[PDB]
Design an enzyme around this catalytic site. Structure first.
Site, PDB file in Angstrom:
ATOM      1  CG  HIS A  41      -0.926  -0.040   2.432  1.00 49.39           C
ATOM      2  ND1 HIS A  41      -0.380   1.029   3.077  1.00 49.39           N
ATOM      3  CD2 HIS A  41      -1.219  -0.931   3.398  1.00 49.39           C
ATOM      4  CE1 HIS A  41      -0.290   0.780   4.365  1.00 49.39           C
ATOM      5  NE2 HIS A  41      -0.795  -0.415   4.588  1.00 49.39           N
ATOM      6  N   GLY A 140       1.061   5.437  10.993  1.00 50.11           N
ATOM      7  CA  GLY A 140       2.486   5.331  10.796  1.00 50.11           C
ATOM      8  C   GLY A 140       3.081   4.005  11.200  1.00 50.11           C
ATOM      9  CB  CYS A 142       1.637   0.564   7.789  1.00 55.62           C
ATOM     10  SG  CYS A 142      -0.085   0.916   8.059  1.00 55.62           S
TER      11      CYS A 142
END
Lengths: 299, 299
Positions: A41, A140, A142
């Site tokens: 992503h 943040g 991820c």
């Protein structure tokens, strides 16, 4: 003595965390040998993104990888399911011995929460039966990873991708395959119904006995089938003979037969705890595996 | 979202743990610069040991210090209160920026449980008002340390020395001064009466509101004195104006005045939770400081 939600020492994983920036998105990556793994992503640019098309439009130089205060040069990029593999021109000198394992619902692992490639905290959690985890993650995070450690080998099992509407978390194994029926695209996706991990509750009751909590014990025993009929009523998973076998060592150490402890659990489910606590909890705890109990508790 | 008992990443501390053997005793040491710190009870040889006499009879070569698979040569030894300082011929190349701080009852810290100089797990705990900690420690864990991390500086605050009869733990700061009325000699010493850390419970209720738990909120407010009269009845510590001030940022973020939340806590103490839970607990949790909540929760 004592019993705590204990994580594995995080040093070997800290040495692998990097920052990956592409476009306007910054998240975390996992740097092992000369590859950086991160959620796909991060790719620039929407209800049904075709990531294959979006990745074809990117160049190596779009990916800014920062390891501490050193920039790493990306020399290749490829997709593996929902993870991106960024080949870099430098092998990580801190790469531990490692494996990519996929875990089962009911198993536990340590999470190293990271932001901007910088580790911030470590905690323990379990893969829920519905393939979510009840983590603690802010925007943040991820790319933060979950892992277990066996004799200096790190078994990576989880990479964080998203938060569901109920506040629980979903992610992939390190091959990029999601745990559960979740997707890295915007949907109304939601955690399915969950259950309580019965074998873990029993393990935790054995931990309690090892640590001096005995008030819930009784002289009764039950049959496996009779227990499982009570389990189903209270939204507990079925207990198998394999579960009983796995609880063998704890049963032997305490001298309490597994089906004896099952009679205790039945009574606790039917009666509550009557204002008492077990190992500092007023709830039946299900995020400790039999292995977690044996590892932490006296022999 | 989410809220977990979160420890600091342990890597900087893992790089400092060594094994100290002397006589028949093996325990853990903390290797910083060219000094190894460990509990002085490693000294050979009893109701009232005179450690000064026992240390005069030892030689540098009695102390076997192992850092991984490298033996460190002890070139000096001295006592500092209840800690031993072993000067070694090699400075630790992994020494982080560090401080020796002593913490207050009610403050939290991370523990790196170690055995034979090898880290085994990391967890969070609080210094109780009675200066014990509810840790998880087995035989061999003496010398494991507790710490906080502020911008890559490790503030060491605890070294583990012993288990009390109730199963809770006692130790020193890194200057060797015990927390609480405990001694490193065999006595019937026992934890004194404890209390609940009120400001932390309030902080945790703010964490719950930040995370969507609101069922315990009410329209009422209370005076500080009226709250503290209820606190004393339930064995809660007094709440000070400084506590109220410290909770200011959380109160502002949530829009719930501190004395408003105090009215919620009063009702929870008087009524129980009526089968409901807060942040996955059926008990009022008191081992999260206001700082812990701000650090972990959304802004």
């Amino acid at each position: 003595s004592g019993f705590r939600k204990m994580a594995f020492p995080s040093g070997k994983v800290e040495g692998c965390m990097v920052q990956v920036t592409c476009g306007t998105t910054t998240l975390n990556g996992l740097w092992l040998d000369d590859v950086v793994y991160c959620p796909r992503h991060v790719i620039c640019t929407m209800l049904n993104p075709n990531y294959e098309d979006l990745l074809i439009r990117k160049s190596n130089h779009n990916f800014l990888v920062q390891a501490g205060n050193v920039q790493l040069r990306v020399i290749g990029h490829s997709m593996q399911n929902c993870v991106l593999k960024l080949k870099v021109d430098t092998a990580n000198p801190k790469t531990p011995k490692y494996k990519f394992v996929r875990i089962q619902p009911g198993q536990t692992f340590s999470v190293l929460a990271c932001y901007n490639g910088s580790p911030s905290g470590v905690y323990q959690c379990a893969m829920r039966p519905n393939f979510t985890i009840k983590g603690s993650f802010l925007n943040g995070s991820c790319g933060s990873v979950g892992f277990n450690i066996d004799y200096d080998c790190v078994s990576f099992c989880y990479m964080h991708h998203m938060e569901l509407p109920t506040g629980v978390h979903a992610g992939t194994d390190l091959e990029g395959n999601f745990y559960g029926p979740f997707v890295d695209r915007q949907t109304a996706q939601a955690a399915g119904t969950d259950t309580t991990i019965t074998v873990n509750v029993l393990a935790w009751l054995y931990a309690a006995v090892i640590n001096g909590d005995r008030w819930f014990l009784n002289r009764f025993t039950t049959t496996l089938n009779d227990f499982n009929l009570v389990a189903m009523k209270y939204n507990y998973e079925p207990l198998t003979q394999d579960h009983v076998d796995i609880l063998g060592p704890l049963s032997a150490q305490t001298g309490i037969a597994v089906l004896d402890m099952c009679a205790s659990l039945k009574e606790l489910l039917q009666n509550g705890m009557n204002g008492r606590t077990i190992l500092g909890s007023a709830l039946l705890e299900d995020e400790f595996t039999p292995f977690d109990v044996v590892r932490q508790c006296s022999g």
